[model samples]
Target: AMKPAGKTFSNVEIFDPPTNYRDPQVLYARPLELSDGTLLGTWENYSPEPPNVWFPIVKSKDGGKTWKEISKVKDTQNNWGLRYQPQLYELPRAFGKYPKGTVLCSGSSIPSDLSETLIEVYASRDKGYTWEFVSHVALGGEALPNPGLTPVWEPFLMTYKEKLILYYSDQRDNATHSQKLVHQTTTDLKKWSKVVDDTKYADYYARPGMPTVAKLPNNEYIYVYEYGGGPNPPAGSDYWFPVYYRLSKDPQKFLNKAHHQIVSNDGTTPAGSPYVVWTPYGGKNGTIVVSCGTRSEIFTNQALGDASAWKKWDVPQPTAYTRSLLTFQKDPDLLMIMGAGILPPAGGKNTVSASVVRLSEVMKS
Candidate 1:
């Protein structure tokens, strides 16, 4: 079923089995709206065989109505596959030797043994047709998710000032906190600065992860994530992976104060792998849309991250581990949600897909 209003919002598959290689648990699907209104997407594609693991670039020319695989990002620096948590970014201004509109991808490069995690960058000048390795941002020990493992996961890219920023969850400071969110910036996309803490909970058990950022119309920044370490709700109630966010004027500094956990009016707690985006729709303050792993209903706020501004809207999109949010380039009111299906062991066939909804409809509801 699709919504009306001379608008279309339905599940459109970006990749499926038979035609595309079958991967049981494709994860972390992300979509990027290009300068010319072209839609590009990517995900953590796992290959059943050796040496084929890489992030595939899929392109859609008709506002995501259809898609085709145009290129793949292979690891040229290390033998490790370009596996897990892929992010796509389009340069808005000329940076270094790369001109404006250069498409960049960042992913965790890890060996099959999962011995180490390297966040590497790749670039494509001819739109999404071909790619070349650029540089590695950070490296850490083993792919284990535990406290002492020291592995890095999830790369989110953005351009600020004259530099490109890469935000990720780091476990290297396990001695202080199990995991903390940090970011580094590179002017040339080759040399990265030292890590700067964005959110570091004092509790060793507290893991603030899967960071995604958006700039509100007010020019302030909001960063959203799931609090892995939580002291749950009161005795009778339970909620896992509660979503939290921090608002700051400076995107580089989010730990200025404690963050707020998102809870709906009726006490619905959206959880896990939270992604956020803001659109110039609804009202003067605009609408901030956020997606979580556990719910098909998306959370929206228009009062600049005020606690009382949060509300949930019912949508027909299926829940996925790291569903990404992107405002249509031509129509900011049209919001696109893209993702692979739920993670394995959760019992669902993973397919890379997307659904675009008009934000006006969700705001009115």
Candidate 2:
């Protein structure tokens, strides 16, 4: 569908206040396009309160207009929580050289408590301003057969053939019940292997959690996931936590067929909670930025019915749970971007902030 008519750019909240403490928040945002182009973003900053926050990388030479925060790559100690959902790729022969060789960035941690939320990687080489902690591929006992005290949030990374896969959603049969999406691989990220275990689409029972991974452009590789399934909306109204997509050339057969929910929040009225982020731009034409939310009203996906087909924008309010979309800019035409923030709950306070939007102004009315 389509709804963004024009003049739209007003989500300006970059995290500022008493050291940032809103509510465990900061949606997923992965973007790294350098070599003169300039643009970097890696998001994730949850905090009920304490040292349980991870994923951090922010920079914008000019594309999104302005942004610069960089720093927070995971150090452990404090309570071990290094949450997940992070991305930033740029290693296909290094793309255009000059101190831009390795950039890979992945997330998902849980140092203790019996473990199971493992899936870490952090490399910078240079560009990202110094970082090095590459290893931890995939944990939770390789994909949970019967193990899971905790840890298994979200870990998504991409690179298909050249090797370096890593996708996560945890809970295979740890008795915790069953959560899907799991895959693993590595050519160099530090030796690893074990692709697609549940992958997604088992029958779609529930819990699929943030998956996000894209290579597309023909290289073929699309992940996209978050099928929460409960919070409300089901019978026929739809809406709850719908967001599905799958594609693969051979990331270990990506769940072996059948997958295409595309996007969902289902019927509307109060249903629209997508969180997509796929950026592919060489000169333009490639874009997929969706960070939707609709609760009180106002944010329409055509009132949940998905207004024409799918293309709605209008964000700014108490809505900010999970969102990460980025493409920055491709030439002068293609510009699908997204970055969200607004995590204020616990004692309230507020600080860990972020924002950068422009998916055709979020699709308008």
Q: Which predicted model would earn the best TM-score?
A: 1
For residues 1-365, could you state the per-residue lDDT of candidate 2 as single tens digits? 88874322344455443444334345555566766677677665654545666666777666645668776676453256666567676666532221235776777665434345566777787677767776776566432323333346566666655665666777744453457767777666667875456454334345666666555555555555656554445677653565555666665676775554533345443233445545542123244444544331222222112223344344443454454444543442234334444333434543333344444444421
Specify the highest-lDDT model's number.
1
Model 1 lDDT per residue over 1-365, tens place: 79874345689888864334444458889999888989889988877647748898999888888888888998888877898889999999887888899999998999888899998889999988898888889898889877778999999987777878899999987777889999999888878999999998778877789999988888888899888866585456553568999988778888786689998777888888899999888878888899999889899988999987799998778998988889976787899988888866534478888988887776673
* The 10-residue segment with the lowest total lDDT in model 1: 16-25
Instruction: Show model 1 residue runs off by greater than 4 Å.
Output: 1-7, 18-24, 233-239, 346-348
Q: How many residue pairs clash in each candidate?
A: 0, 19
**By TM-score, how accurate is candidate 1?**
0.94
Q: Which stretches of candidate 2 lie over 4 Å from their true place?
A: 1-29, 32-38, 41-60, 64-104, 107-118, 123-131, 134-138, 141-153, 156-168, 180-204, 211-225, 228-273, 276-311, 314-323, 326-365
TM-score of each: 0.94, 0.31
Worst 10 residues of 2 by lDDT: 296-305
